[PDB]
RNA sequence: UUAAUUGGAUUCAACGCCGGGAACCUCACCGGGGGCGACGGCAGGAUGAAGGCCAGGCUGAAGGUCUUGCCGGACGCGCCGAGAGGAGGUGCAUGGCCGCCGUCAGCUCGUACCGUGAGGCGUCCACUUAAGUGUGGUAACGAGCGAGACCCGCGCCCCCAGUUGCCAGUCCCUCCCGCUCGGGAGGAGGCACUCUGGGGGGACUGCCGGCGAUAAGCCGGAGGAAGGGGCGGGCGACGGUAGGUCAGUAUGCCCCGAAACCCCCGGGCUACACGCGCGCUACAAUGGGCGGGACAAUGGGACCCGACCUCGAAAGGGGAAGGGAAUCCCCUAAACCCGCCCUCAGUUCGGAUCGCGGGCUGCAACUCGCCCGCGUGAAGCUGGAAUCCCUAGUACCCGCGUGUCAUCAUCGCGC
């Protein structure tokens, strides 16, 4: 009864792996991170501003 | 006749050129016809994100780009030549895929 | 001379008037009541519009070689207004072009390469380039520069 | 926004003081000499130094 | 897919980076590096006190060797621990060191000045230390101590200046410190030498 | 207004903002049921469970609970400490982040000098720059950040190498046609142009003349593919706004602890006499309809791109090649012109608005998806004071694609 139902679709299925929010999860080739968390890991991922 | 198609891919251009030079030197020192490194279309992964951490503020956005570059090396089949591409010192970021074509 | 040396409009008109005679090509009983495309707003006006479709579709098989139904739908698609929402590009109907292709395939002008498309038989090429060189003769007389 | 930057106006004076005879009024010549004499990697600043030393050498003989 | 694999391996490496930063706050965790061979993932880690990472009898590292093979799904993490050559040349290491210093009841002006003098003593060139938070009252304040050359704008600063952000916990609150270190080895593009 | 339209935010700098994702989830809102409580102290203990388990009934639901009767073998919870958690709260209690004064043109340091001092110059003045950009005088001289420099991409040329590209030339082979001139297409084989990308050059107030102190730098000129911050950006320092963000991350403080905990579901977050903002379209003869044709491009694709065979109007179904990226697909762009039809009308504009019947998705969309076709056709037929912004591949205007993502955006992004 204390289990969360199994969802493959919708926001409740997708969660950011770092922060844990249920909101903005960019999935370009499988990142699983929130949109703002993406900035605190930008330069470790190899990304560079141009 | 048989050819080996070697696809090298990396982010830093210098590592890719290093491995290309090593492959070219090895192919010429082994005396094997090699089709020179053909620089394939670099893939440009572009991501846009709003810089505002909240719903307050002017709408400012930032675009970040990965330029992942790739090269193609078509060499002729030679076992003595194929024994000297597994011993090459490969930088970590460089990925090499070596297939065979009739 | 070939279709490539002549305008598309005049050549499709010639193929349409010529193929109107052939009995294997005919508009089905549901053709006069169903518009040529989803995106279309009104019904077709002229009653020859079926044969024109055939006159065009075979020309497509003359140019692209293997052709299927979905790509034909995308090509014949067009812009439809969505009321308060903006105009959008939509695909056309599929059954009409599918029936036209089947009628031409029974006509021997086109054939099916399964897993690659519908291609054009040598006889279809002969008929199309015959009409095209007919038109090229006529337009050479009208326009001498086409001799070049 | 023409103005030649300060550190260019500083570099060129020393460059032409040490090797005055080396430079002439030709822009490509003085540019190659700047390239071989200095360690600039930016083509643009190389050519800017070349332009300023071109003008400087031009003024050397006017008075 | 190449695009589905480069990003996946990078994000896993950086999740490990964050996880070890969390686990190695006391060890002066300075840097990480990953190599892949068929034997497995050679995990190189540079820390300011390798003995602290080893701990006693290699008990601690062994435990870490467990987490990596269960938490992150890696194939034979082979962990090797080393020392940073000049910890005063790394922004992150000195940032964490100053955070630990201020967490030890050490006065902000004194500790910041001492760290700045030490880093200047190690052969660095440019030092910047911004301290933010409640420092001399209930209100919050920010104060910056800098020494030497440091151009903060341009591509060179992105490439030559090491940045490090640390946060220091205290009963009154959490104090931010930003440490920017410019080594002497780098060269600004406006530096042309005659011969 | 409602039980609910959760909440944050207030003019510039909120108001297609958080929302780059309300059918359940999102949730932090309303109703209902159900169940958690770490570990110490005391008590029980095991003589059997704390968990499920029917026959059935009170529960929308389930050993939830209830009469019921068992296990599975073994620690469960009652109170004080006090937990785990909290989108429970306090953003003049913070860190960071974002916003604007603002990529602005400024802000600083050593000594010396003036001043009893709060403090002054340097940092001032003339010319000039996008820029504390540089130059002549100056009680000052040196020096740092900022802007510049720097980095990214773009067009002119060339080397290196090509399973991108072709009646470039094209013996040989294949197909069709012709006026026999040749036309077009493939293989053979080649690497020719762009192309993809490893480098370098060119291009730089370079020169003519004038202006300007002859300086800085400016104007006009020519030559050059491109010229006097080459084009657009990344890079916005010192403080201020006690701006917003503890409803995300770290977190000051306080508060609940069968709750201020958690789980499940019905609804709400979409509710309207309404005010305001922003995008989309409708306010035709440029026009609506049939048919032909010149056309890209950013990127993406594995339960996916899905070509393609076949059936069904159709949304789609059965099969199905190729594809994890210059190899296959998304693939069509759209704008445009013409062969033709309609004849200045709230209509052949325009579809809202209803009801019908089909399609996709998902446990399910009436609150709460769209599309496919059918009778139906609103208002709108050029809109006051006043009113915001762009200035050359630019305004205007026209579309493609994709992020998030089954669907939802008329949105944002970027082509």
Author numbering:
A (entry chain BQ): 6 to 55
B (entry chain BM): 1 to 102
C (entry chain BV): 2 to 149
D (entry chain BT): 2 to 64
E (entry chain BC): 2 to 196
What does the paper say about this structure?
The resulting cryo-EM maps (Structures I and II) revealed a dimeric architecture comprising two small ribosomal subunits, mediated by two well-resolved homodimeric structures of the aRDF protein. In this arrangement, the 30S–30S dimer is connected by two identical aRDF homodimers, each composed of monomers A and B, and remains unoccupied by mRNA, tRNAs or any translation factors. The analysis of the cryo-EM data using maximum-likelihood classification revealed two distinct conformations (Structures I and II) of the aRDF-mediated 30S–30S dimer. The two structures differ by a slight movement of the 30S subunits toward the central axis of the dimeric architecture, using the two aRDF homodimers as anchoring points. Specifically, the 30S subunits were displaced by ∼3 Å toward the center of the dimeric structure, accompanied by a rotation of the 30S head domains by ∼4° toward the aRDF homodimers. The head domains of the 30S subunits exhibited a lower local resolution in both Structures I and II, indicating a degree of flexibility. This finding is consistent with the observed rotations of the heads when comparing both structures, and it correlates with the binding regions of aRDF, which do not hinder the rotation of the 30S head domains. Although the relative positions of 30S subunits vary between Structures I and II, the 30S conformations within each dimer remain similar to each other. Indeed, the structural architecture of the 30S–30S dimer suggests that aRDF would hinder the association of the 50S subunit with the 30S subunit due to steric clashes.
